[PDB]
Design an enzyme around this catalytic site. Structure first.
Site, mmCIF file in Angstrom:
data_model
loop_
_atom_site.group_PDB
_atom_site.id
_atom_site.type_symbol
_atom_site.label_atom_id
_atom_site.label_comp_id
_atom_site.label_asym_id
_atom_site.label_seq_id
_atom_site.Cartn_x
_atom_site.Cartn_y
_atom_site.Cartn_z
ATOM 1 C CG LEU A 286 7.824 8.791 14.508
ATOM 2 C CD1 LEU A 286 6.780 7.649 14.637
ATOM 3 C CD2 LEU A 286 9.067 8.102 15.038
ATOM 4 C CG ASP B 115 10.328 -5.823 4.094
ATOM 5 O OD1 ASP B 115 11.500 -6.066 3.882
ATOM 6 O OD2 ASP B 115 9.659 -5.108 3.535
ATOM 7 N N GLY C 297 0.908 -1.261 -0.173
ATOM 8 C CA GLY C 297 -0.055 0.020 0.126
ATOM 9 C C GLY C 297 0.733 1.224 -0.031
#
Ligand SMILES: c1ccc2c(c1)Cc1c-2n[nH]c1-c1ccncc1
Length: 281
Positions: free
Chosen positions: A76, A120, A16
């Site tokens: 962040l 990942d 996505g």
């Protein structure tokens, strides 16, 4: 959801696209990910909402609307890849590298203690803030649902179907080396180039160092045999404590690879502190 105003795309993955967005009714700024809908996905993602830790990007809301999947995450201000590129001239200060490594190991020890793997890890999914914190992002998503192979563990590359938490320790070890040397450790551009780059540096694995390796699915007796090379040559700037720790994070045998919990107790972190990064947002 029309409940969000999209400011800008802060990235894209295969699971996505991610956008910086503002909650149209609460003004809150977030990272909005539209997942690219099975119930298992819904259930696994719903589990992630409870997996909260100071070193894990907070999943604020999960929006399953109009048969779509949107993940609302805390925003962040910078990812580690950008921070690394911006610090390429001087390199990230060691105390900061150590702080970041320590924090990420805390995050991993937490998720691993809950049987949740990231699968990942990479500089792009490690996010930092102005206060010196670093957090793991986009995880628990792999199992729930060009891709870089640079941080992929050897057991995954050799075809192991049921890999463990050790795959995350391997990825973090590669990132640790990268922060220290200012160059990716194993920049492969194909599965075999990746595997052979690992072999050329750590030596081709055999039954002596990795029992069971020769029977792995994608293992071939025809693999060239390279000799291992000294870590002194691989990560020169790093002191012996860091080198010893890195060597245990890069053990071929997943069962021999150090755990996050054990890594936290390594002498390397005896003098760990929490410096503030030099950020430019
Ligand atoms: C998945 C889940 C949450 C987040 C991401 C990916 C990326 C991301 C996420 N949260 N914040 C950020 C970010 C902030 C500043 N610059 C780049 C990224």
């Amino acid at each position: 959801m029309e409940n969000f105003q999209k400011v800008e795309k802060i990235g894209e993955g295969t699971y996505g696209v991610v956008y910086k967005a503002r909650n149209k009714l609460t003004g809150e700024v977030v990272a909005l990910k539209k997942i690219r809908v099975p119930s298992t996905a819904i259930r696994e993602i719903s589990l992630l909402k409870e997996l909260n830790h100071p070193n894990i990007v907070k999943l604020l809301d999960v929006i399953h609307t109009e048969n779509k999947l949107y993940l609302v995450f805390e925003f962040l201000h910078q990812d580690l890849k950008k921070f690394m590129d911006a610090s390429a001239l001087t390199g990230i200060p060691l105390p900061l590298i150590k702080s970041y490594l320590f924090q990420l190991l805390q995050g991993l020890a937490f998720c691993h203690s809950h049987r949740v793997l990231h699968r990942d890890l990479k500089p792009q999914n490690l996010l930092i803030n102005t206060e010196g914190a670093i957090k793991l992002a986009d995880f628990g998503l792999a199992r729930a649902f060009v891709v870089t192979l640079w941080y992929r563990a050897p057991e995954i590359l050799l075809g192991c179907k049921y890999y463990s938490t050790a795959v995350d320790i391997w990825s973090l070890g590669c990132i640790f080396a990268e922060m220290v040397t200012r160059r990716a450790l194993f920049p492969g551009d194909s599965e075999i180039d990746q595997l052979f780059r690992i072999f050329r540096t750590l030596g081709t694995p055999d039954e002596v160092v990795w029992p069971g390796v020769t029977s792995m699915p994608d293992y071939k007796p025809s693999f060239p045999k390279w000799a291992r090379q000294d870590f002194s040559k691989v990560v020169p700037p790093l002191d012996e404590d860091g080198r010893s720790l890195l060597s245990q994070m890069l053990h071929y045998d997943p069962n021999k690879r150090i755990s996050a919990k054990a890594a936290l107790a390594h002498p390397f972190f005896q003098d760990v502190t929490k410096p503030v990064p030099h950020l430019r947002l």
